[PDB]
Design a protein around this motif. Structure first.
Motif, PDB file in Angstrom:
ATOM      1  N   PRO A   8       3.108 -12.230  -3.567  1.00 53.78           N
ATOM      2  CA  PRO A   8       3.554 -13.481  -2.981  1.00 53.78           C
ATOM      3  C   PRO A   8       3.916 -13.370  -1.510  1.00 53.78           C
ATOM      4  O   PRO A   8       3.721 -14.330  -0.768  1.00 53.78           O
ATOM      5  CB  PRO A   8       4.791 -13.846  -3.829  1.00 53.78           C
ATOM      6  CG  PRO A   8       4.534 -13.188  -5.145  1.00 53.78           C
ATOM      7  CD  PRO A   8       3.898 -11.875  -4.766  1.00 53.78           C
ATOM      8  N   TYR A   9       4.405 -12.198  -1.105  1.00 59.96           N
ATOM      9  CA  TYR A   9       4.860 -11.927   0.254  1.00 59.96           C
ATOM     10  C   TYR A   9       3.819 -11.205   1.124  1.00 59.96           C
ATOM     11  O   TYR A   9       4.147 -10.730   2.222  1.00 59.96           O
ATOM     12  CB  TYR A   9       6.146 -11.068   0.189  1.00 59.96           C
ATOM     13  CG  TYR A   9       6.088  -9.899  -0.798  1.00 59.96           C
ATOM     14  CD1 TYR A   9       5.384  -8.738  -0.503  1.00 59.96           C
ATOM     15  CD2 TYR A   9       6.735  -9.968  -2.010  1.00 59.96           C
ATOM     16  CE1 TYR A   9       5.313  -7.694  -1.391  1.00 59.96           C
ATOM     17  CE2 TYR A   9       6.697  -8.925  -2.908  1.00 59.96           C
ATOM     18  CZ  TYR A   9       5.994  -7.786  -2.598  1.00 59.96           C
ATOM     19  OH  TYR A   9       5.949  -6.759  -3.503  1.00 59.96           O
ATOM     20  N   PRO A  39       0.405  -6.720  -5.630  1.00 63.81           N
ATOM     21  CA  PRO A  39       1.727  -6.630  -6.282  1.00 63.81           C
ATOM     22  C   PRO A  39       2.330  -5.253  -6.337  1.00 63.81           C
ATOM     23  O   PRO A  39       3.538  -5.142  -6.274  1.00 63.81           O
ATOM     24  CB  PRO A  39       1.434  -7.139  -7.701  1.00 63.81           C
ATOM     25  CG  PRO A  39       0.378  -8.183  -7.474  1.00 63.81           C
ATOM     26  CD  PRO A  39      -0.494  -7.629  -6.373  1.00 63.81           C
ATOM     27  N   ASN A  61       2.352  -3.258  -4.032  1.00 63.60           N
ATOM     28  CA  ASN A  61       2.616  -2.971  -2.627  1.00 63.60           C
ATOM     29  C   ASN A  61       1.577  -2.110  -1.894  1.00 63.60           C
ATOM     30  O   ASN A  61       1.815  -1.734  -0.767  1.00 63.60           O
ATOM     31  CB  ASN A  61       4.033  -2.441  -2.452  1.00 63.60           C
ATOM     32  CG  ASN A  61       5.082  -3.480  -2.817  1.00 63.60           C
ATOM     33  OD1 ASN A  61       4.942  -4.676  -2.505  1.00 63.60           O
ATOM     34  ND2 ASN A  61       6.138  -3.034  -3.451  1.00 63.60           N
ATOM     35  N   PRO A  65       6.836  -3.690   1.365  1.00 63.09           N
ATOM     36  CA  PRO A  65       6.529  -5.000   0.775  1.00 63.09           C
ATOM     37  C   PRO A  65       6.706  -6.113   1.811  1.00 63.09           C
ATOM     38  O   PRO A  65       7.811  -6.302   2.322  1.00 63.09           O
ATOM     39  CB  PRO A  65       7.557  -5.163  -0.350  1.00 63.09           C
ATOM     40  CG  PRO A  65       8.187  -3.841  -0.534  1.00 63.09           C
ATOM     41  CD  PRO A  65       7.876  -2.956   0.619  1.00 63.09           C
TER      42      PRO A  65
END
Ligand SMILES: CC(=O)N[C@@H]1[C@@H](O)[C@H](O)[C@@H](CO[C@@H]2O[C@@H](C)[C@@H](O)[C@@H](O)[C@@H]2O)O[C@@H]1O
Ligand SMILES: CC(=O)N[C@@H]1[C@@H](O)[C@H](O)[C@@H](CO[C@@H]2O[C@@H](C)[C@@H](O)[C@@H](O)[C@@H]2O)O[C@H]1O
Ligand SMILES: C[C@@H]1O[C@@H](O)[C@@H](O)[C@H](O)[C@@H]1O
Ligand SMILES: C[C@@H]1O[C@@H](O)[C@@H](O)[C@H](O)[C@@H]1O
Ligand SMILES: C[C@@H]1O[C@@H](O)[C@@H](O)[C@H](O)[C@@H]1O
Ligand SMILES: C[C@@H]1O[C@@H](O)[C@@H](O)[C@H](O)[C@@H]1O
Ligand SMILES: C[C@@H]1O[C@@H](O)[C@@H](O)[C@H](O)[C@@H]1O
Ligand SMILES: C[C@@H]1O[C@@H](O)[C@@H](O)[C@H](O)[C@@H]1O
Ligand SMILES: C[C@@H]1O[C@@H](O)[C@@H](O)[C@H](O)[C@@H]1O
Ligand SMILES: C[C@@H]1O[C@@H](O)[C@@H](O)[C@H](O)[C@@H]1O
Ligand SMILES: C[C@@H]1O[C@@H](O)[C@@H](O)[C@H](O)[C@@H]1O
Ligand SMILES: C[C@@H]1O[C@@H](O)[C@@H](O)[C@H](O)[C@@H]1O
Ligand code: NA
Lengths: 314, 314
Positions: free
Chosen positions: A107-108, A131, A133, A156
Motif C-alpha cells: 500500500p505504501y 508486501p 518490502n 517500507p
C-alpha cells in the motif's frame, strides 16, 4: 494563494518528461485526478480539462518517455495495483496494459519507470515495492507484462529513483536505481549487460529522513563513461544533490533548494558537458501560493537558478 | 519496521480523548479506515478489528469527549463533507447525525471539535474551512446541526486547534481556537460569554511552516483563570509548545520533541497544578518503526519524557 494552486494536492507525487526544452509535468489534484501541465515556449494547462486518469489519493506518480512521441505515467489504484496511462503520437491518451497484469504491491510502495536507452524498440522497466518490502522489477518487451528481477529488501515506503543509459561502446542498455535501506542509508543498485545486477549496494548518502523522496537522471553517455545526478529531501527541508561525474565517481554532495516538509521531487535533463550543457530541471513544492508546484533550473549560461515560480494551474 | 506499524498511514491525522489516565487514540490506516487504540492500564487494539469507520485517504481526524461516556470522532467523506462517528456508553458505536447536514468543506480542510465545558448537556462545536477559506463553526445544541459563527479567513489548509473550558466564576463556557493566517502567523481567536467572539486575533507565533499541524488543550480553570498549551510542528521538524499560564499570559515557547516532516499532532490533558498535576500526553509520528505513532509524556514526578515508543498495532 490562487484557486488553481488550491487544486494541487499538498505533497503530491510529481513526475516530468521532456524532449530537450519541451516539457511535461504530472501531478495529482485534490480529488485524486492526475493532470498534465506543459511547456511549449511557455507554460499552460494543468486544469480539470487536462486530466489523464485517476489514482488513489496520495499515490506515487512516475513517468518516462521517448522524447514526446511515447509517454508512460504510472500510479497506484485504490486496490494497490500498478496502472499505466499512455500517450502515443497520433493515438493520444489511453490506458496501457499494465493494469491487466494486476500486479499487487505494498500500500505504501513508490514507483520508478524507465524506457531502456539506446534502442528504437519500446522496452520498459518499472520498479515498486512488494508486501514483503522487496523491490520488484516489472518488464515490458513488446509481448506482455512480466516480472523481472527482484532486487532485495528495502525500507517500507522507500522512494525509488531510476535511470537508463547506453554506453557508446556497449551493445546494450544499462540501468541504475536508488532507494533507502532499513538503516536509513540511500543506496545504488546497478545493472550492466555483462555483469547483470551487480551483487553489491553502493552507499550514496549515510543517513536520510525515513521515506524521503528520491529522483534521478543521467546524461552524456560515452565510451564506458556516464554522468548521473540523484536528488532527495534531507532533514533540513531542502533538496540535496549527489553527483556522479566521469573520472571522479561519487564526488560531490550538497543542498540545492528549500522545499516544504515531505515534498516529492522530479528531475529531467538533456544535453551534455561536451555540447554546451547539460540542462537540468527540478520540480517540487516549496510553499509558493501554499500548494503550487515550483521549478529549479541549471544550465551552462547561469548555473543554479529558481525557475517558474508557480506552474499551471497556479 | 514491524508489520503492525506498516498498517499506519504515513502522516495520518491523529486525535485523542481521555478520562484522567483512561485513554483512546484515533488514526487512519493505509486503506482509509479509522482505527482506535486504547489504554486501560496497558496499551491495546488499533487492529483491523478496531475499525470505527472509513474516511477519504489523508482525511483530518479530530475527536472530543465527555470523559469516556460520550466520544465523537470527526473526519471527511470522499465527497469532502463532514461526518461523525459517535460512541455512548450503553449503545456502542454508531454513525452520528452530522452527515445528515451535508456540510461541504474545502478538500484541504482540517477539523477541530469540542464539547462545551461546564455542563452535563451535550453541546458540540466543530470548526473547519469552507471553499472560500474562511473558518466556519458548526453547532449541535440537542436539536439538530446548524452553522454557528463564521470566524473569517485563514491560510488554505490551515491546521486548527480548539479547547473549551469554564471559569468557576462565569455563568457559561469559554472557547479558544487557533489557526494559521495567510502571512504564516499562528493566531488565537476567543469566545467568552460577555464579549462573544472577541474581535482581535492574538498572535502566538510569528511564523510557522505552511499548513503545519496545530493542537491545543486547557486545564485547571479557576476564577477568571486558565492554563493552555498549543502545539505545532516547526521548521526544525520538532513539535513546539506555546504556554498560557494564569498571571503570566502567553509567556513561553520552545521545542518539545522531534517528529517526521509533516507529522500531525494530538494533545490530551487532565489534572491541575493545584492538585499535583497536570498530566499531558502528546501523540505524533517521529519515525519509530518508520510509521508508528509515538507518545510524549509530562507529569510532576519526572517532567518531560518520551512515553510509549510505538502505539498499537505496532
Ligand atoms: C492502435 C495502436 O497504436 N496500438 C498500439 C499497439 O500497436 C501496441 O502494440 C501497443 C503496445 O502497448 C502499450 O505500449 C507499451 C510500450 C506498454 O506501455 C503497454 O503497456 C501499452 O499497452 O500500444 C497500442 O495499443
Ligand atoms: C525548577 C522549575 O522551574 N520547575 C518548573 C516547575 O515549577 C513547573 O511546574 C513546570 C511547568 O512546566 C510547564 O507546564 C507543563 C504542564 C508543561 O507544559 C511544560 O512543558 C511547561 O514548561 O516547569 C518546571 O520547569
Ligand atoms: C525550458 C524552460 O527553461 C527556462 O527558460 C525556464 O525558465 C522555463 O520554466 C523552462 O524550464
Ligand atoms: C506529447 C503530447 O504533447 C501535447 O500534444 C499534449 O497536449 C499531450 O497531452 C502530450 O503531452
Ligand atoms: C535489462 C535487463 O532485462 C532483463 O534481462 C531483466 O531480467 C533484467 O532484470 C534487466 O532489466
Ligand atoms: C555509472 C557507474 O557504473 C559502475 O561503474 C558502478 O559500479 C558505479 O557505481 C556507477 O553506477
Ligand atoms: C550539471 C551541474 O553539474 C555540476 O556543476 C553540479 O555542481 C551542478 O549542481 C549541476 O548538477
Ligand atoms: C497514562 C499512561 O501514563 C504513563 O504511565 C505512560 O507510560 C503510558 O503510556 C500512558 O500514557
Ligand atoms: C469508551 C469505549 O471504551 C471501550 O468499550 C472501547 O472498546 C470502545 O471503543 C470505546 O472507546
Ligand atoms: C451529541 C449528539 O449525539 C447524537 O445525537 C449524534 O447523532 C449527534 O450528531 C450529536 O453528536
Ligand atoms: C457557545 C456559543 O454558542 C452560540 O451562541 C454560537 O453562536 C457561538 O458561536 C458559540 O459557539
Ligand atoms: C485565556 C485568556 O482569556 C482572555 O484574557 C484572552 O484575551 C487571552 O488571550 C487568553 O485566551
Ligand atoms: Na504520497
Amino acid at each position: 494563494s490562487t484557486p488553481g494552486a488550491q487544486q494541487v494536492l499538498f505533497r503530491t507525487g510529481i513526475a516530468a518528461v521532456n524532449s530537450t526544452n519541451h516539457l511535461r509535468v504530472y501531478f495529482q489534484d485534490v480529488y485524486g485526478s492526475i493532470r498534465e501541465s506543459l511547456y511549449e515556449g511557455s507554460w499552460a494547462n494543468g486544469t480539470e480539462k487536462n486530466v489523464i486518469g485517476n489514482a488513489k489519493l496520495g499515490s506515487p506518480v512516475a513517468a518516462t518517455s521517448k522524447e514526446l512521441k511515447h509517454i508512460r505515467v504510472y500510479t497506484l489504484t485504490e486496490g494497490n495495483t500498478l496502472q499505466e496511462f499512455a500517450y502515443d503520437s497520433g493515438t493520444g491518451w489511453y490506458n496501457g496494459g499494465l493494469g491487466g497484469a494486476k500486479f499487487q504491491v505494498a500500500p505504501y510502495s513508490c514507483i520508478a519507470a524507465v524506457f531502456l536507452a539506446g534502442t528504437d524498440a519500446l522496452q520498459l522497466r518499472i520498479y515498486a515495492q512488494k508486501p514483503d518490502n522487496t523491490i520488484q522489477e516489472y518488464m515490458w518487451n513488446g509481448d506482455g507484462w512480466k516480472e523481472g528481477t527482484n532486487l532485495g529488501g528495502a525500507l517500507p515506503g522507500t522512494g525509488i529513483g531510476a535511470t537508463s543509459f547506453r554506453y557508446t561502446d556497449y551493445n546494450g542498455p544499462s540501468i541504475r536505481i536508488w532507494f533507502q535501506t532499513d538503516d536509513l542509508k540511500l543506496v545504488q543498485r546497478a545493472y550492466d549487460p555483462h555483469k547483470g545486477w551487480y551483487p553489491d549496494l553502493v552507499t550514496i548518502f549515510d543517513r536520510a529522513p525515513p521515506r524521503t523522496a528520491i529522483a534521478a537522471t543521467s546524461f552524456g553517455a560515452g565510451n564506458s563513461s556516464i554522468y548521473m545526478r540523484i536528488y532527495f529531501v534531507n532533514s533540513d527541508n531542502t533538496i540535496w544533490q549527489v553527483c556522479w561525474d566521469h573520472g571522479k565517481g561519487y564526488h560531490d554532495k550538497g543542498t540545492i533548494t528549500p522545499v516544504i516538509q515531505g515534498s516529492e521531487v522530479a528531475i529531467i535533463s538533456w544535453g551534455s558537458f561536451a555540447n554546451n550543457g547539460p540542462d537540468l530541471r527540478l520540480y517540487f513544492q516549496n510553499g509558493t501560493y501554499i500548494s503550487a508546484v515550483s521549478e529549479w533550473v541549471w544550465n551552462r549560461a547561469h548555473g543554479s537558478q529558481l525557475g517558474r515560480s508557480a506552474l499551471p494551474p497556479a
